[PDB]
Paper text:
Arabidopsis thaliana (At) carboxylesterase 15 (CXE15) and carboxylesterase 20 (CXE20) have been shown to deplete strigolactones (SLs) that coordinate various growth and developmental processes and function as signaling molecules in the rhizosphere. Here, we elucidate the X-ray crystal structures of AtCXE15 (both apo and SL intermediate bound) and AtCXE20, revealing insights into the mechanisms of SL binding and catabolism. The N-terminal regions of CXE15 and CXE20 exhibit distinct secondary structures, with CXE15 characterized by an alpha helix and CXE20 by an alpha/beta fold. These structural differences play pivotal roles in regulating variable SL hydrolysis rates.
Numbering used by the authors: 8 to 38, 41 to 329
Amino acid sequence: PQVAEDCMGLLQLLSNGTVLRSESIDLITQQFKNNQTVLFKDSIYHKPNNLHLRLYKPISASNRTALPVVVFFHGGGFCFGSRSWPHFHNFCLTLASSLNALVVSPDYRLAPEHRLPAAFEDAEAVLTWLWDQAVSDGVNHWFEDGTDVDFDRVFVVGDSSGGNIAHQLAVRFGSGSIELTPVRVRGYVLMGPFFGGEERTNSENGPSEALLSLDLLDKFWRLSLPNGATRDHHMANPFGPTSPTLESISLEPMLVIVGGSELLRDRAKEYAYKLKKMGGKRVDYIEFENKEHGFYSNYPSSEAAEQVLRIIGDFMNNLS
């Protein structure tokens, strides 16, 4: 059937997004009366793969002080998503304005065309691109304006599959493997992190969500993990028999945020508490009762979404 080549090409066109030619400004309503302007523009960070990221600058506080960096990795189960998608663009406008930080929102290669670890390799290229900009006075060319950026205050915020990406970066940075001074990642925020495993948890065997189901999560892993791999692969299960030696590596402080009704609740809770009992690991586990996957971005202007942005801000303030 040729209708199969088309549904494949549909996935590519669906998450291809667009690239802005010039810088643009949007209005974002803060926690409909209080507004805020956020400057943003697209830049290429990997020329061979034609991968772009979006930089966000809150205009009001950028001229007041040096901004910390928030690298945001969007979700999509390693198969969907783009930094230009309005759902993710709106969340980054909220991230920049509420956290008073420069937001870096990069695209990354998607499965099944680019199976894992293609997404993790792209994430490291993002941080390496950030390092290249930091040491070369490149922030001054980021906009038609000066930009003061505190590269000693970098934070990685990962949504769903981006939360998995954030964990892989935290491991690679904490193991002394990659090292990008003066870029210093002080903390990691894992928001409903897309972790997997062959054996099911109780919440994974529970009722389906508004969008997520256990069958959909299985199809995500199967289409994104390499051919012939199981859900116990280290790229899916952080505690699989491949790279579970997290006791040795020095992990940065972490924040795990999930909804109480999430299918991925038990995996993230087990992930956080296995880390809390490892020595030298500061991990805060926060569970929002009766919420499903992506409540912080699926329902903005709701109380739960605003509390998440506050918790991330407090988490950033304490770490610096």
